[PDB]
Amino acid sequence: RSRLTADEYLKIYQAAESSPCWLRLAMELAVVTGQRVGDLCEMKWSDIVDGYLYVEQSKTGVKIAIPTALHIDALGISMKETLDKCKEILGGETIIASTRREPLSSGTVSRYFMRARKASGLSFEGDPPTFHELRSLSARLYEKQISDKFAQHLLGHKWDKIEI
Amino acid sequence: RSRLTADEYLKIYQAAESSPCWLRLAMELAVVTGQRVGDLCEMKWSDIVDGYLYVEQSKTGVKIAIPTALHIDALGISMKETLDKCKEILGGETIIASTRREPLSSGTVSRYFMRARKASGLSFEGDPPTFHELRSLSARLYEKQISDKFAQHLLGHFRDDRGREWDKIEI
Amino acid sequence: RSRLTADEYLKIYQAAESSPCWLRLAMELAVVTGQRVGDLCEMKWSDIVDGYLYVEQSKTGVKIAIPTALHIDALGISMKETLDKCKEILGGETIIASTRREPLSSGTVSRYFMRARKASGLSFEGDPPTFHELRSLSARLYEKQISDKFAQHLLGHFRDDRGREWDKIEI
Amino acid sequence: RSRLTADEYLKIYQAAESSPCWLRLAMELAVVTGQRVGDLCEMKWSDIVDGYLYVEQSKTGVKIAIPTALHIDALGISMKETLDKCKEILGGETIIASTRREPLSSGTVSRYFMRARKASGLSFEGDPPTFHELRSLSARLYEKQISDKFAQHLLGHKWDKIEI
Amino acid sequence: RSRLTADEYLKIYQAAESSPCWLRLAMELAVVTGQRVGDLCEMKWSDIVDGYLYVEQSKTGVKIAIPTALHIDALGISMKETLDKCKEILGGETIIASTRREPLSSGTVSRYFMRARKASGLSFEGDPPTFHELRSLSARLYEKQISDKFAQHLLGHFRDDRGREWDKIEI
Amino acid sequence: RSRLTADEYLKIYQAAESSPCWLRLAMELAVVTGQRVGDLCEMKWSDIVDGYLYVEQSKTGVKIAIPTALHIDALGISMKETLDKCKEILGGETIIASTRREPLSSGTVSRYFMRARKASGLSFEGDPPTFHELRSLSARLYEKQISDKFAQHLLGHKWDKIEI
């Protein structure tokens, strides 16, 4: 299906204005960490140790340690800043959490992103991009900003520490 | 005049996507060093000696030695990384330089920042923040991360060289 | 500082005969739009949509939509005519531009205006009026021609676009 | 006889400092409207209707409607501004009027212009220009500023509305 | 802000050894004429007539005729000698000009002066003196050499030409 | 022996900070007048008449009149300014004088300059320059700034008035 460009992300992010607060935060976390929505929903505060967010991908078993100093230039996302916002605004045991501080599921996150997407009025060639497409956007952005190698390493394609 | 928060800095930073390459770098350098724009524009590579960026403030005459190991945690800004980028991307005699490696003036930096600010679409209570507001942001962020004493020290509110005395910034 | 009257504006305008082509046009645009020089220098052709010149004041953040049908009767200044001249004679990305189609800075505009002012040979009580005085002139002329409310509106003292709200100027 | 250049007009205008107030106003009106002195003296406020000054030339019968929005760049003359000054300063039934608010004749206007001309100290090759030469100056100035066609149309050489 | 003494002027002058050729000349012209930097940058060769440099101050409108025979004894500055050097070394339409004979702006002059000031290594009580401090120095030196009346006259605190009246400076 | 460059003069001048006040003043006077130390020590206030310092060189008999308006650009030395400082700070019958206002000898001046030189930490190829080398520095500086002819005229190599 259709991909998601940076400009399109900005339009959806804007429409997410009237969405629950965690949606915009989940979008930021998805692009800056490049992790699958299933893993994003599993992330907990105890997973962060000494400036590194440890992630064992549920689907692949790939274990990586993501530096919280990461940032995506094109969208102006600072991983630390996003994490600070998740801590203060959401305040759950899970980094990403509902308004009632409960863990979120992939279906719920994807569903709300879809609503924000419709609210933006964007048109796409073929099936509109889902929340999952934020992972490809992350790779494409990190490739230009750093390197295709870095993008691949971060996505889990190769605890394996992520550096740069 | 309105202040600029860390989240607002990031919106403007994003909006700077279509600005000259030096804008984002000047923004980062302003927040991590806390120096006035006039002084940012004066900084040269020869001012860095043994991991320290020597700055004599143009307006006040205050002489400080800034450790290049500094980081602004809230925004993920590393002074060393930023300087590396300035060297690799701008490559002028001055740390901040145009695409043609020429020095920049305070007016030009402020002007481009103002344009990126408008592009972000942010709304402000009162007059919008200018590039100068990045110095106040630096202070508030450093006050939290390190201390009110550190911030006042960095802002300019003793490695004695060949005559002149410099205030060494620590931690 | 001294004010500038309509008759004095014309003496300086005459004196601008030997000034760059953009000076007279910048003078006309300053009086008919009432915008600060910093904003005049920022205006671009892309800011004009369906007979309206959109302006976000750099200093205040005030967003207004100026109808291009405006006229300053006292001096025979037509905004549309002036814009046509700017397009045909200057032809830059910015409405006001140099002979090389480059953007102009507030300092340059003020400097050339100051020179034309001296060339006119006018005498003033107190410090002579600067290019900024054209904004006050705009207000006084509009206050008489239309209303004190209109002038304050134009000076910056609701076409809602993609997010941002604009104050539409009427009559 | 000799012509009158823009710089020469400025010198005479300067010397007109000590001349009756209507002289400078008549000079401005002469250059911006390009009309003969005989017609200038006949102009009345009732001749202006909806931003147009209607003039039927006495000598030729040519009927033209001059837009009050006209202006001469070289000399910084705004027709509306000059008319506003004539209204406030002179205040007669005729646009151009004496100090005692009475109509002026061509001879009087020409005579005072001649005195201002002498007072300026200018030297000319051949007979000095008279007030009549302001009409040629008008044409030469409007030609450069707009076009020879416009100059001719305004002078009455071709109610005929004047536009541009 | 700190004042600048005659001895300090010489230290900065020495330090200007590696500055553009126009810096030392602009410094000399500032002290011997006592004019604001904005006006120094505006001066042209056509302004000198029969041994007098005609200056209409941009800010105040004050019109003075400065005799080119002036000297600043305390520093050995001769106005005629300085002007000769400006003509021979700079050779622009403006008395003070860049290496490419282009006019200079107040900001550029101040900026280079500030750099020479730092290079001298002088220490100051309070904010260091800027190029503007050369005008106060001119006044204090002239007050001693000639009189308080002369200084106030020169600073701008009657050869009547074609309309405009000029204040002739004497002795 | 080794020569003295302008940069070296600046370093020694800086080290002269802790030297008697007359040393720095003697250094300035030596470079701006280009006279031998023996003559510098003989200079008196009565030798200055109408902006000219009259000097009859002891060794050669050469009589020259040095304009007090002279200045050395490279070192920022104004002869008048230096003389003003000698008058106010030293206040002796001799232009150059000791702390107790007594005349100085060549040996004393040379000796203190040597101490300031050592204090600067400079290294030289061959024998370090003595106070006498300030005379050569003067010539080399005046040559570039004005002309070799001027340098020679000032040094006494050709009352003979010095001009320019």
Q: Concatenated DSSP letters for A25-36? A: HHHHHHHHH---
Tell me the C-alpha distance between E16 and C58, whole Å. 38
Candidate from B10, B15, B24 with C-beta closest to A78 = B10
Q: Cα-flanking dihedrals φ and ψ of residue A55, to 5°?
A: -130, 120
Q: What is the 3-state secondary structure of F92-144?
A: CCECCECCCCCECCHHHHHHHHHHHHHHCCCCCCCCCCCCCHHHHHHHHHHHH
Chains F and A touch (3+ CB pairs under 8 A): no
Tell me the C-alpha distance between E40 and E90, whole Å. 14
Partners of residue F84 in chain E, C-beta under 8 Å: 74
Size of interface C-E (CB pairs under 8 A): 17
The candidate with the shortest Cα–Cα distance to C131, out of C103, C112, C153, is C112
Q: Could you tell me if F10 and F120 are in contact, meaning their C-beta atoms sit under 8 angstroms apart?
A: no
* Minimum CA–CA partner of A67 in chain B: B76
Q: Could you tell me if C101 and C8 are in contact, meaning their C-beta atoms sit under 8 angstroms apart?
A: no
Burial E63-97 (b: 16+ CB within 10 A, else e): bbbbebebebbbbbbbbeebbebbeeebebebbbb
Tell me the C-alpha distance between F97 and F113, whole Å. 15
Candidate from B42, B59, B105 with C-beta closest to E127 = B59
Burial A107-143 (b: 16+ CB within 10 A, else e): ebbeebbeebbebbebeeeeebbbbbbbbebbbbbbe
Partners of residue C133 in chain E, C-beta under 8 Å: none
Q: At what angle do helices B106-120 and B21-33 cross, to 10 degrees?
A: 100
Closest approach of A146 to chain B, Cα-based (Å): 12
Partners of residue C107 in chain B, C-beta under 8 Å: 107
Q: Could you tell me if C48 and C165 are in contact, meaning their C-beta atoms sit under 8 angstroms apart?
A: no
Which residues neighbour D11 within 8 Å (Cβ) at sequence distance 6 or greater? Answer: D120, D121, D122
Burial D45-75 (b: 16+ CB within 10 A, else e): eebbeeebbbbebeeeeeebbbebbbbbbbb
The candidate with the shortest Cα–Cα distance to B101, out of B35, B21, B37, is B21
After what residue numbers is chain E broken, C–N > 2.5 angstroms? 157
Partners of residue A78 in chain B, C-beta under 8 Å: 10, 74-76
The partner residues of C101 in beta bridges, in order of sequence, read none
Q: Which fold has domain C1-171?
A: hpI Integrase; Chain A (1.10.443)
Tell me the C-alpha distance between C11 and A125, whole Å. 61
Q: Which residues of E touch F (CB under 8 A)?
A: 6-7, 10-15, 17, 24, 71, 73-76, 78
Which of the 8 DSSP states describes residue B51?
Answer: T
Enumerate the active-site residues of D: 36, 59, 132, 135, 157
Tell me the C-alpha distance between E1 and C118, whole Å. 32
Q: Could you tell me if F104 and F26 are in contact, meaning their C-beta atoms sit under 8 angstroms apart?
A: yes
The candidate with the shortest Cα–Cα distance to D97, out of D44, D35, D30, is D44
Partners of residue E115 in chain B, C-beta under 8 Å: 42
Task: Answer yes or no: do B13 and A74 touch at CB < 8 A.
Answer: no
* Minimum CA–CA partner of E38 in chain C: C111
Enumerate the active-site residues of F: 36, 59, 132, 135, 157
Neighbours of chain D (3+ CB pairs under 8 A): C
Q: Which residues of B touch C (CB under 8 A)?
A: 107, 114-115, 118, 121, 123-124, 127-128
Task: Answer yes or no: do E61 and C123 touch at CB < 8 A.
Answer: yes
Enumerate the active-site residues of A: 36, 59, 132, 135, 157
Residue E131 CB neighbours (<10 A): 25
The partner residues of C53 in beta bridges, in order of sequence, read C48, C66
Q: Cα-flanking dihedrals φ and ψ of residue D137, to 5°?
A: -60, -45
In the numeric block, which tokens belong to residue C159? 């076409």
CA E25, distance to chain mean position in Å, is: 8
Give the CA count within 13 Å in the CB-facing half-sphere of F70: 29
The candidate with the shortest Cα–Cα distance to B131, out of B15, B35, B14, is B35
Q: Which residue has the tokens 């501080």?
A: A101
Closest approach of C38 to chain B, Cα-based (Å): 10
Q: Cα-flanking dihedrals φ and ψ of residue D38, to 5°?
A: -60, -40
Q: Which residues of E touch C (CB under 8 A)?
A: 42, 56, 58-61, 105, 107, 163-164
Tell me the C-alpha distance between F90 and E86, whole Å. 36
* Minimum CA–CA partner of E121 in chain B: B164
The candidate with the shortest Cα–Cα distance to B90, out of B82, B101, B79, is B101
* Minimum CA–CA partner of B112 in chain C: C42
DSSP C29-85: HHHHH---HHHHHH-BGGGEETTEEEEE-TTT--EEEEETT-EEGGGTEEHHHHHHH
Per-domain residue ranges for chain A? 1-164
Residue B14 CB neighbours (<10 A): 20
Which residues neighbour E81 within 8 Å (Cβ) at sequence distance 6 or greater? Answer: none
Residues constituting chain F: 164
CA C154, distance to chain mean position in Å, is: 11
Which of B18, B109, B123 should one mutate to test binding to chain C, selecting the residue with the greatest count of C CBs within 10 A?
A: B123
Q: CA torsion sign, C9 to C11 to C16 to C17? A: positive
Task: Answer yes or no: do B128 and C163 touch at CB < 8 A.
Answer: no
Q: At what angle do helices D133-145 and D148-155 cross, to 10 degrees?
A: 140
Closest approach of C8 to chain B, Cα-based (Å): 31
The candidate with the shortest Cα–Cα distance to D56, out of D71, D38, D70, D80, is D38
The candidate with the shortest Cα–Cα distance to F19, out of F101, F77, F124, F98, is F98
Task: Answer yes or no: do E127 and B163 touch at CB < 8 A.
Answer: no
Q: Could you tell me if B43 and B53 are in contact, meaning their C-beta atoms sit under 8 angstroms apart?
A: yes
Tell me the C-alpha distance between A77 and E43, whole Å. 52
Tell me the C-alpha distance between C96 and C90, whole Å. 7
Q: Which strand (E) or helix (H) includes residue B72?
A: strand B71-72
* Minimum CA–CA partner of B107 in chain C: C105
The partner residues of D97 in beta bridges, in order of sequence, read D103
Chains E and B touch (3+ CB pairs under 8 A): yes
Q: What is the 3-state secondary structure of chain D?
A: CCCCCHHHHHHHHHHHHHCCHHHHHHHHHHHHHCCCHHHHHHCEHHHEECCEEEEECCCCCCEEEEECCCEECCCCEEHHHHHHHHHHHHCCCECCECCCCCECCHHHHHHHHHHHHHHCCCCCCCCCCCCCHHHHHHHHHHHHHCCHHHHHHHHCCCCEECCC
3-state secondary structure of C8: helix
In the numeric block, which tokens belong to residue F158? 């050709």
Helix and strand totals (H; E) in chain F:
7, 6
Closest approach of C42 to chain B, Cα-based (Å): 9
Closest approach of B106 to chain E, Cα-based (Å): 10
In the numeric block, which tokens belong to residue B44? 């040269």
Candidate from A71, A74, A85 with C-beta closest to B76 = A71
Candidate from B107, B115, B127 with C-beta closest to C61 = B127
Tell me the C-alpha distance between C164 and D148, whole Å. 49
Q: Which residue has the tokens 């046009």?
A: C25
Q: Cα-flanking dihedrals φ and ψ of residue E58, to 5°?
A: -55, -45
Q: Which CATH class is domain A1-164?
A: mainly alpha
Candidate from B107, B118, B121 with C-beta closest to C163 = B121
Which of B104, B110, B111 should one mutate to test binding to chain C, selecting the residue with the greatest count of C CBs within 10 A?
A: B111
Which residues neighbour C133 within 8 Å (Cβ) at sequence distance 6 or greater? Answer: C1, C2, C3, C4
Tell me the C-alpha distance between F160 and F164, whole Å. 13
Closest approach of E60 to chain C, Cα-based (Å): 4
Q: CA torsion sign, D103 to D109 to D112 to D113? A: positive
Burial F79-107 (b: 16+ CB within 10 A, else e): bbbbbbbbeeebebebbbbbeeeebbebe
Tell me the C-alpha distance between D124 and D121, whole Å. 10
The candidate with the shortest Cα–Cα distance to D130, out of D161, D109, D157, is D109
Residue F160: exposure state from Cβ atoms within 10 A (0-12, 13-18, ≥19)? exposed
Residue D134 CB neighbours (<10 A): 26
Tell me the C-alpha distance between A122 and A113, whole Å. 13
* Minimum CA–CA partner of C11 in chain D: D76
Closest approach of B11 to chain A, Cα-based (Å): 6
Q: Could you tell me if E133 and E5 are in contact, meaning their C-beta atoms sit under 8 angstroms apart?
A: no
Task: Answer yes or no: do F76 and E6 touch at CB < 8 A.
Answer: no
Task: Answer yes or no: do B76 and A75 touch at CB < 8 A.
Answer: no
Tell me the C-alpha distance between F97 and F90, whole Å. 6
Residue C156: C-alpha distances to residues B134, C8, C60, C63, C167 (Å)? 26, 25, 8, 8, 9
The candidate with the shortest Cα–Cα distance to E128, out of B59, F13, B127, D48, is B59
Q: Could you tell me if D136 and D4 are in contact, meaning their C-beta atoms sit under 8 angstroms apart?
A: yes
Tell me the C-alpha distance between B32 and B53, whole Å. 12
The candidate with the shortest Cα–Cα distance to C72, out of C22, C129, C144, C11, is C144
Tell me the C-alpha distance between A41 and C26, whole Å. 58
After what residue numbers is chain D broken, C–N > 2.5 angstroms? 158
Tell me the C-alpha distance between E96 and E118, whole Å. 22
Which residues neighbour C9 within 8 Å (Cβ) at sequence distance 6 or greater? Answer: C27, C31, C75, C134, C137
Size of interface C-D (CB pairs under 8 A): 39
Neighbours of chain F (3+ CB pairs under 8 A): E
What order of strands is seen across the sheet that includes strand D48-49?
A: D48-49, D52-56, D63-67, D160-161
Partners of residue C59 in chain B, C-beta under 8 Å: 127-128
- For chain A, helix, strand, coil in percent to 5 are 50, 15, 35
Which residues neighbour D143 within 8 Å (Cβ) at sequence distance 6 or greater? Answer: D150, D151
Q: What residue type is B162 in one-letter code? A: R
Tell me the C-alpha distance between F10 and F33, whole Å. 17
Q: Cα-flanking dihedrals φ and ψ of residue C103, to 5°?
A: -65, 155
Partners of residue E59 in chain C, C-beta under 8 Å: 127-128
